[PDB]
């Protein structure tokens, strides 16, 4: 069937959220026409990658609502509310970024060997170099700053908001934190992100973080501190 501007923009965004790997589902039925009728082109996967790449990295000044640099009102810097109705993310253009706040994860990963270590890590005593915690007792909220996003952080009964210089979105599903994936001659994710946990929400009563605690060892080899890591839990909820 036909879709108006309103319904088609939601599915258009729904496809972007799927390609960014923030969603695992989509409603794109009718979208292909919608791009022929309202945009006069064929919006295959190649087209959508070019829109993601150009919006987040290779900007060209002013962008419109469909991530091109109807839909003749081109904006400036800031954010599109990529909202499919089913899900949404506040994503920022690369024109509003000073440098490249993304890292290239197809490039080789520094070796990190596993080691014995504390199974429980206290939120006030986090010696991991990949995680930095801020406790806001006044606001009853916790902000976890992830410094090495390539090391997974897994949520367990958590209702969090992910904040970054790329996209901002909510996470409510157990498992590894989903991050935006952009393709620019390789795979790119944000260089840092922030997990915001509101302890005033009953849904976070048992919020626990599972991650690899990365540690700089005493040994310096090849002019670098050797890295070791151990699996650990950071309990954040009251009754965790």
């Amino acid at each position, epitope marked *: 069937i036909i879709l108006t501007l309103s319904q088609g923009l939601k599915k258009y965004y729904g496809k972007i959220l799927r390609l960014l790997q923030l969603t695992l589902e989509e409603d794109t039925e009718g979208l292909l026409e919608w791009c022929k009728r309202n945009l006069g082109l064929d919006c295959d996967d190649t087209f959508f990658q070019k829109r993601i790449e150009e919006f987040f990295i290779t900007g060209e000044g002013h962008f419109n609502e469909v991530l091109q640099f109807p839909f003749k009102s081109y904006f400036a810097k800031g954010f599109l509310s990529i909202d499919s109705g089913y899900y949404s993310a506040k994503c920022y253009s690369g024109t509003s970024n000073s440098g490249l706040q993304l890292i290239n994860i197809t490039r080789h990963s520094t*070796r990190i*060997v*596993d*080691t*014995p*270590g*504390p*199974k429980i890590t206290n939120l006030k005593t986090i010696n991991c170099i990949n995680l930095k915690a801020s406790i806001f007792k006044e606001h009853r909220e916790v902000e976890i700053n992830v410094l090495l996003p390539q090391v997974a952080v897994n949520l367990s009964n958590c209702h969090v908001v992910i904040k970054s210089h790329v996209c901002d979105y909510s996470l409510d599903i157990d498992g590894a934190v989903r991050l935006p994936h952009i393709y620019h001659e390789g795979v790119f994710i944000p260089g840092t992100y922030k997990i915001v946990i509101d302890k005033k929400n009953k849904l976070n009563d048992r919020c626990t973080l599972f991650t690899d*605690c*990365v*540690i*700089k*060892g*005493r*040994e310096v080899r090849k002019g670098q501190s*050797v890295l*070791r*890591q*151990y*699996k650990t839990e950071i309990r954040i909820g009251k009754a965790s």
Partner: antibody
Amino acid sequence: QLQLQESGPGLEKPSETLSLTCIVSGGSISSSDYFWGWIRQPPGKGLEWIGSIYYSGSTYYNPSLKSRVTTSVDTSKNQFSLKVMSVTAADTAMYYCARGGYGGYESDAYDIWGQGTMVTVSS
Amino acid sequence: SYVLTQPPSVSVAPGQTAKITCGGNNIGGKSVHWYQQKPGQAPVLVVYDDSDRPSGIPERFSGSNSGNTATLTISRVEAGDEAGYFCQVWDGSGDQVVFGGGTKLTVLQ
């Protein structure tokens, strides 16, 4: 220097509990970068890790033996200990205590070893 | 239950180079340590973290680790090098210490 010394009964009866103690000397067992482990070696066989314990009490066991071994640590006496429940002749072995890196700062190799104490299970 | 695979034995003439392998799946991703054990004695750490030597270990000992095999190499072998050699890793998946079965090195006599 830091020296480890096993202390054992030499002889244990079948279906009884073997108890070994390692005395740490020349330094404190309350080391934040190391934990304390038991390794055994039956006659003619290779090395087998039993378990390791951190001064705070956290234990790490070999899965094959977790159901019948336990480790403790006594920070006041500067020793840790090992208990092996319901022993048979399969537990006749040289028992070693050793120190290994823990928590990422030091290498997890077992650098300092005891002398080994010999335990025979017999009626 | 991560499995380490060592050859049962290896012979070498005095002055030649001995090599003792330790096989494991993606063992290059782990830190491999080597212990030397002479008859009736506690084991002694000779190589740690694939290729580092504790103080007092002669330069003739050297280690490497990549892919599925780690290797202990002893150059200019002397009679006193005759011993059992064990490889060892911490297995992060099984949360356990794993020792190889040991390799009996004999020096021709």
